[PDB]
Amino acid sequence: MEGESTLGVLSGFVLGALTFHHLNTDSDTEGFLLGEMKGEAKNSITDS
Amino acid sequence: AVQAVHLESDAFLVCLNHALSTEKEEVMGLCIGELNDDIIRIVHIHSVIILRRSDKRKDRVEISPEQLSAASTEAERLAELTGRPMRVVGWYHSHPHITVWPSHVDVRTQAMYQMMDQGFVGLIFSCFIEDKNTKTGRVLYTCFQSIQAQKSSEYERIEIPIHIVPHITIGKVCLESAVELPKILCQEEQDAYRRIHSLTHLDSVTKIHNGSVFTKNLCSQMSAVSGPLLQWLEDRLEQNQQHLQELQQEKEELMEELSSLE
Ligand SMILES: [Zn+2]
């Protein structure tokens, strides 16, 4: 198997908050991202 | 190999009403009847069983040997109830917005079924064909079998003459088959919902959304299928009452004509 993808997901508001924190900082800025990572299985069918 | 096919209009109606049920996917079913010799080998199709397709997708139409077991059980039941020698003799599917002819995959599947018995025949219904240039509607049907090519594998199609036998009135078997379509649609939606609930650890608002989707789907099913079908059956009952009155009048007229004449 080992058929693995690694999609990333966000919400509009979190990107807005990062953008806001940045626009207030007159320099580079940085921080940490907290969330959860979950694997989903799709048993694709090919012809028959 | 089969040389002709007679289809009872009684069952052609079930097939046609199944084909016009949906345009978004292709639908399928099996045909029960008998083999006969007269004047030539002929297949008389009396009734059909509607089937639910799980894999769906375009052009991928197959029937599981599980469905064959269920169909053969129903065939034995109908053979004992009706005293007819009924075996599963054919299959049919729909080609909506698609030419009535079989695809190479349809023909390969027909050949895979002929491997069971070379006496097996296939049907295809081409439904709503749209053409604003002619501004006319069209609906077709055809029957076919398959033959091994001169070259390796690559099976080829062959045409079978098919006629519709005028079955002046409705058999109860066809009503009992037609009322199975709403049941199968409802069961399909219910199985989708049950498989959705398997991951119990899921958001509550999401479960409300999925419940709303299930309700909307069954509302559509009742608005588009069960409702019109029930309206059709009521209209048919009214038509039959009027026709009974007219035929009673005609019977009395002919009785008088033969009593007074000679
Ligand atoms: Zn097909």
Side-chain angles (χ1 to χ4, degrees):
Chain A
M1 187 176 57
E2 208 188 319
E4 304 184 307
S5 180
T6 62
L7 171 61
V9 183
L10 259 173
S11 78
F13 304 98
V14 171
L15 179 57
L18 285 167
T19 304
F20 182 74
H21 166 58
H22 171 65
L23 289 170
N24 283 343
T25 303
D26 60 350
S27 61
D28 294 341
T29 192
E30 62 192 356
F32 295 86
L33 301 172
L34 307 180
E36 65 183 342
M37 182 262 303
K38 295 302 178 180
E40 326 301 341
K42 184 170 183 180
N43 192 11
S44 58
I45 313 173
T46 61
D47 178 17
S48 293
Chain B
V2 170
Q3 291 288 12
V5 171
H6 288 189
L7 172 58
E8 298 289 341
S9 59
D10 202 12
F12 180 95
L13 177 53
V14 183
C15 291
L16 173 54
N17 279 3
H18 184 205
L20 295 180
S21 67
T22 184
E23 76 181 58
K24 280 190 68 64
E25 66 166 337
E26 309 171 61
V27 298
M28 68 183 193
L30 288 179
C31 304
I32 320 192
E34 73 184 336
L35 287 165
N36 207 339
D37 305 312
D38 217 349
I39 309 176
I40 307 303
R41 289 180 287 273
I42 307 171
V43 176
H44 292 246
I45 302 176
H46 290 270
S47 66
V48 297
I49 295 178
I50 305 182
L51 284 176
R52 182 177 66 184
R53 191 157 62 105
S54 53
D55 63 326
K56 301 203 166 192
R57 305 165 288 173
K58 296 190 174 179
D59 193 19
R60 310 301 181 173
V61 180
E62 285 192 6
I63 297 93
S64 325
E66 292 72 16
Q67 307 318 316
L68 297 184
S69 179
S72 61
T73 299
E74 288 291 342
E76 289 181 26
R77 186 183 68 86
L78 295 172
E80 284 178 334
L81 174 62
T82 67
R84 306 309 198 274
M86 303 191 65
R87 58 168 299 248
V88 191
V89 289
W91 71 304
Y92 73 89
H93 68 275
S94 67
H95 285 182
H97 295 300
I98 289 292
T99 317
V100 70
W101 303 115
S103 73
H104 62 290
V105 178
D106 289 322
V107 174
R108 189 172 300 279
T109 308
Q110 169 57 20
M112 178 177 64
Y113 289 140
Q114 283 176 217
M115 293 164 183
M116 285 177 69
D117 64 87
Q118 66 280 356
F120 201 70
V121 301
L123 295 185
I124 304 184
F125 291 77
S126 178
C127 321
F128 23 79
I129 297 298
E130 58 191 15
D131 184 10
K132 69 130 59 176
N133 299 287
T134 61
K135 201 141 54 179
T136 64
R138 184 165 54 249
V139 168
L140 312 92
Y141 60 81
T142 183
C143 180
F144 75 106
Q145 259 192 330
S146 64
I147 290 172
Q148 173 57 50
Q150 310 84 19
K151 298 84 56 163
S152 182
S153 175
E154 301 307 63
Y155 293 89
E156 309 181 18
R157 77 184 186 85
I158 179 159
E159 294 184 32
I160 287 184
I162 185 164
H163 298 281
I164 294 175
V165 176
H167 200 276
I168 306 306
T169 51
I170 308 171
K172 77 176 185 162
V173 179
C174 290
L175 294 170
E176 298 155 357
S177 302
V179 297
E180 192 182 12
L181 172 56
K183 182 191 88 181
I184 289 170
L185 290 166
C186 180
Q187 190 175 326
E188 187 167 341
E189 279 294 351
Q190 282 193 31
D191 292 335
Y193 195 82
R194 294 155 175 170
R195 284 190 174 286
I196 285 160
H197 267 61
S198 69
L199 292 190
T200 54
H201 307 298
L202 178 60
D203 175 18
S204 55
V205 178
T206 300
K207 291 174 187 177
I208 299 168
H209 168 277
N210 294 351
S212 302
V213 165
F214 177 84
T215 53
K216 182 217 70 187
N217 277 6
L218 284 194
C219 283
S220 301
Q221 287 191 10
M222 287 173 51
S223 168
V225 178
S226 304
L229 180 63
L230 188 52
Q231 173 178 247
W232 155 236
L233 291 177
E234 284 199 5
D235 303 332
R236 181 78 171 189
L237 198 296
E238 286 184 312
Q239 291 168 3
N240 280 5
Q241 290 299 340
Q242 220 66 11
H243 195 44
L244 283 164
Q245 293 185 346
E246 291 177 12
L247 284 178
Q248 179 61 28
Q249 178 58 22
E250 184 155 16
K251 172 178 186 172
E252 291 170 17
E253 288 176 5
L254 286 188
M255 283 262 187
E256 168 59 15
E257 285 183 26
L258 290 180
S259 302
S260 294
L261 286 178
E262 65 166 355

